[PDB]
């Protein structure tokens, strides 16, 4: 009713759908970015609850098949592949691309071409 | 009433702190997340101000070498490769992996292994 109260009601309204159009814009954009990265690179990339990175291939044979990478160091980005039920099945690719070449891109590339070549058209 | 004023003043303060908390958390997570995608996939993906996806390889032979993809429409994820200077130099990857195989992941995987294997010490 009073000017000082009328003004403070505008200020909460303004801050309400300043945060509420902030969340709905983060959400659309994050999902757009993450989806583009799915369709282009053929990996869903999640931040886990342990702040680690989970990768699931578009050509995954089973739906729970995934790779988990931890950020070793804050400074830039080195990453360690952690052990999953699926990482057990690609020791060949780990030896050639992670141990010897020291290239996660080269590894994930090889892995995408190996999984993609298993997809039946039927 | 001064009860309205005090209550509304908390609400303004509270909403303004949530917005600041939201902005500084988001900024931190997207930068870690965008750096995570680059280290793992070997592609810097950025949403161009025309809402298209510009891709730069970690193994790009020249600075300014990049691929641009356009989303067909928000519904689903089919995307079109747009003309860039770099696109002209990989007509064979495009023929084999985009036209014949209809797989952007296969394409980006083939390209990555091609660029990686060209990157020599001398």
């Amino acid at each position: 009713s009073s000017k000082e109260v009328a003004e403070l009601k505008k200020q909460v309204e303004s801050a309400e759908l300043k945060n509420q159009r902030l969340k709905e814009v983060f959400q659309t954009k994050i999902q757009e970015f993450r989806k583009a990265c799915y369709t282009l690179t053929g990996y869903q990339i999640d931040i886990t609850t342990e702040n680690q990175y989970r990768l699931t291939s578009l050509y995954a044979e089973h739906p729970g098949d995934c790779l988990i990478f931890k950020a070793t160091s804050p400074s830039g980005s080195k990453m360690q592949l952690l052990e999953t039920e699926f990482s057990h099945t690609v020791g060949e690719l780990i030896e050639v691309h992670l141990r010897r070449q020291d290239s996660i891109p080269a590894f994930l590339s090889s892995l995408t071409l190996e999984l993609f070549s298993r997809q039946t058209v039927a | 009433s001064s009860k309205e004023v005090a209550e509304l003043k908390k609400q303004v303060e509270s909403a303004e702190l949530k917005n600041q908390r939201l902005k500084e958390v988001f900024q931190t997570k997207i930068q870690e997340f965008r750096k995570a995608c680059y280290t793992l996939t070997g592609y810097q993906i950025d949403i161009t101000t025309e809402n298209q996806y510009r891709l730069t390889s970690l193994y790009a032979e020249h600075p300014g070498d990049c691929l641009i993809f356009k989303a067909t429409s928000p519904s689903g994820s089919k995307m079109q490769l747009l003309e860039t200077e770099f696109s002209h130099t990989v007509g064979e990857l495009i023929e084999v992996h985009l036209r014949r195989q209809d797989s952007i992941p296969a394409f980006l995987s083939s390209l990555t292994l091609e660029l990686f294997s060209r990157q020599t010490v001398a």
Binding site: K23, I30, I47, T49 | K18
Partner: peptide, 20 residues
Amino acid sequence: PTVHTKEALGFIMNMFQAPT
């Protein structure tokens, strides 16, 4: 951690795990 932080972390982490 403070309450607005915990509230903010909860919403953004949800976004970084959702299927596509």
